[PDB]
Design a protein around this nucleic acid. Structure first.
Lengths: 94, 103, 80, 98, 95, 106, 87, 99
DNA sequence: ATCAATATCCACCTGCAGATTCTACCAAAAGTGTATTTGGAAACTGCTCCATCAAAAGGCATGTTCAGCGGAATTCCGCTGAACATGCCTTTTGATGGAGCAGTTTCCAAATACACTTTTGGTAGAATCTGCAGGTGGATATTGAT
DNA sequence: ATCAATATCCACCTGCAGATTCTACCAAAAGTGTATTTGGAAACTGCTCCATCAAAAGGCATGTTCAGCGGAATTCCGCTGAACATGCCTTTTGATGGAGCAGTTTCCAAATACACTTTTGGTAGAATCTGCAGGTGGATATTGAT
């Protein structure tokens, strides 16, 4: 009963793109799940403060972007931003 | 699905739901979950990429916690990002202060 | 024999080794035990506080995970 | 009548334990400590086994890292053997401060 | 022109209660206002997470109490809890 | 009409605190007792720091509390020091403290 | 349009006497001659990190002026909460 | 032969003097230029509320004074009374500002 | 500069704990189509306060001399920890009732939503207030030479 | 232990920047009084998984010997503190243009709100599969006594 959601399957898909012939133990998958949850919370948290500071009721991709710039190290942020911008674009183009 | 529209493996729909149910803001725009899902996917690819190499560099095809630790701590930025994180069963990087070596 | 003494010299020595320590003073073992006790008291105090708020008689892994996180000791591998 | 010189086996252990990841404190003894300390905050408590493990992973990772800082302090003082004052200095600078 | 609020008048009422003939500079008052907001945020934040962890959509005096216990050191937590409880009990005894 | 503060016997604003909790996006709903309890804790802590700050002020023969008195009260109190362990009080200076070995002589 | 400044080498504005005074408040009795430059480097890194975040908040708000609140928020992000400036 | 305090005496006097006061120890204008220079390298055409500059100086000095305390403990630990670059580096390393 | 004792490596083997695979079930998601509501961008502009030019002057930075005493290098031995063979007691492993962690249904005390009425904290600002910064002079140390 | 050059303490005195104290408009606040919704406490319960326990497994407590590290003692080069002369540039008091933060109103692109159709990720007992931990053999490096 009461299903527990996790990013296990989506993490598995990404693994196959990067290393088609590589597996991952259960304990390793659990760590990855913690990682995605942790980062989601840190980014959402910063974005939350950003909207509040600027008296905005909405968290848009703009807040997510600034949050990423605040949270991630130099290069990692650069690519995360480009990946994010790319996904929003591909998305707006139906 | 929204993820397919964005060209992502990570669940946009779910991310959207999570943002909303997390009380981060009164409202959540449509683009926020897309951008966020993509960032989460990219960071995931990055660690798996380096962790996979650690498994290969160790003659193993299955990624274990050990491999995640090696990939994170040997990478300046990931190490920084996870500077206050403890990866269970990760151990530490082999490192001995020179002054302690024989002779 | 006290429980804190259950944390043996060989165990503390192995920990120091992983930490890259070559030689240890005899006074370290008691020092380490005291330090570990304070660490556990702080983390467990908070974990138990989460347990009671949820009205449970059982300390869950999540209680400990939440405790470690608010202590700036985020742990990956046991949920959240 | 073979015998390794002081420090040779120590150095061997460093290499051996920095290679592996298993817990170094014995399970049962750690569990008793956890339970004892918890009995002080709330009586008659139960622990999921995964709760005790998370506690031991966190505790060991904490001590191992503290031992690294303690070693740097010993070396700062031109010694190769760690002493309580080294641990004390490390914690004081960490904000666990005294 | 957009009214900016602060806990100033309240901090001042409590000051007169404990030290009737003592004043407070504007800079010290500014620090006190930062203190109050800071603690407000920390307590509210702990209460927020606490509610989410327990799948509750309501922050009641109970999550506030647990947050105070998680946030304040020993003796400060004991007294904050009594005052909080005392205030809720009295507030409740009224209509 | 009696304010919720007087109904609670508090100096701190219960209505204001309730409002701040709602617009801070902490939870979907905020109970009635929540702001009462929080306002009380806030009042209790400011009373605690002002009691000690006012004392530091009189010790220094001053009638007006300034930032330095706030810092002296906080840093000389174990628990307040711990609660504000990562806080910087502007213009508070530090506590007088010279390491023993630095003192002149034998 | 209008003027010419170009700011350069301002780290040298953090003088030896200023650094000595800060060390004294910190309880230091004797100072190696190499400390001054080491301190300038440490201060520079500290300022770059806080200003980087503060300016990031400024831009996000579409402003051209860095506010005390931008700095206050930046300091809190880095765990250096500051009281006294609206924060 | 003219009065002269012994080495260390004036230093101890200065420690007592500054631990008793709260005024900023770095010259105001020079600190402000440094802030402007660093910021400018990050983003051109910025303006600063004067209180933003003062907030930066209060935080910067509190950070440095506390770093010098830790540094002092590191020097004393090595049997010295003179702080050196390595004491600062050890303190920052244990602080996790480097590790 | 021999070998003698051990630890360390590499290649190969294989039993199995944990990872992988096909399947039927389905409540919870997620996508979609529709009528309604609204946050916040845009355009205009009041008006705060940031940048800056100017001038006067003393607090404080700079640069130097001189030598006190601190850091560093060296010698060294007393003694504390490292290494180790020896006897075995605490931990570990796998098995079994049963305590609670959860899944589910009931249902009401209490939290929205909302149209008013009213008490109030903020504030722009003329004003008399008042704690104490800061200069002054003189009495108790605190230092350091002898 | 007596001295003299100096810094520290300090209660008094005052001109005033900064604070306590109105009189007044008041709009965003907070309290009042129904109406409608619903979160989650409470009672009952199936079923994981936690505590207890007995038997198989192997790490640790204990004493001896001495290698070599820590700490004491001694020495001295030259770093770094104290004092001093000189004069720069920060500080201080002000006026002023205007950049740009910020208040106010018009208004539409976008988000909330159901309502309902589609499909998906998680749960779960079943069966099949497999990476690699661990054990073995033998070669080879490392360490340490001649």
């Amino acid at each position: 009963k009461t299903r527990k959601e996790s990013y296990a399957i989506y993490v598995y898909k990404v693994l196959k793109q990067v290393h088609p012939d590589t597996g991952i133990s259960s304990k390793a998958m659990s760590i990855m799940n913690s990682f995605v949850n942790d980062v989601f919370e840190r980014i959402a948290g910063e974005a939350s403060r950003l909207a509040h500071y600027n008296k905005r009721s909405t968290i848009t991709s703009r807040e997510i972007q600034t949050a990423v710039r605040l949270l991630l190290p130099g290069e990692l942020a650069k690519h995360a931003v480009s990946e994010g911008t790319k996904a929003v674009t591909k998305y707006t183009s139906a | 699905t929204r993820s397919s529209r964005a060209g992502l493996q990570f669940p946009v729909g779910r991310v959207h739901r999570l943002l909303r149910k997390g009380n981060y803001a009164e409202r959540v725009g449509a683009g926020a979950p897309v951008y966020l899902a993509a960032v989460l996917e990219y960071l995931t690819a990055e660690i798996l990429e380096l962790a996979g190499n650690a498994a290969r560099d160790n003659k193993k095809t299955r990624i274990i916690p050990r491999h995640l630790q090696l990939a994170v701590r040997n990478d300046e930025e990931l190490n920084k990002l996870l500077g206050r994180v403890t990866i269970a069963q990760g151990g530490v990087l082999p490192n001995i202060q020179s002054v302690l070596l024989p002779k | 024999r006290d429980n804190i003494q259950g944390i043996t010299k060989p165990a503390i020595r192995r920990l120091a080794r992983r930490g890259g320590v070559k030689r240890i003073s005899g006074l370290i073992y008691e020092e380490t035990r005291g330090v570990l006790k304070v660490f556990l008291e702080n983390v467990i105090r908070d974990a138990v506080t989460y347990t009671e708020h949820a009205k449970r008689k059982t300390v869950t892994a999540m209680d400990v995970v939440y405790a470690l996180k608010r202590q700036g000791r985020t742990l990956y591998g046991f949920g959240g | 009548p073979h015998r390794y010189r002081p420090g040779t086996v120590a150095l061997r252990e460093i290499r051996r334990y920095q290679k592996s990841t298993e817990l170094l404190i014995r399970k049962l003894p750690f569990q008793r400590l956890v339970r004892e300390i918890a009995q002080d905050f709330k009586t008659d408590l139960r622990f999921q086994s995964s709760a005790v493990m998370a506690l031991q992973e966190a505790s060991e990772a904490y001590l191992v890292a503290l031992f690294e800082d303690t070693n740097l302090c010993a070396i700062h003082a031109k010694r190769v053997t760690i002493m309580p004052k080294d641990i004390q200095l490390a914690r004081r600078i960490r904000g666990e401060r005294a």
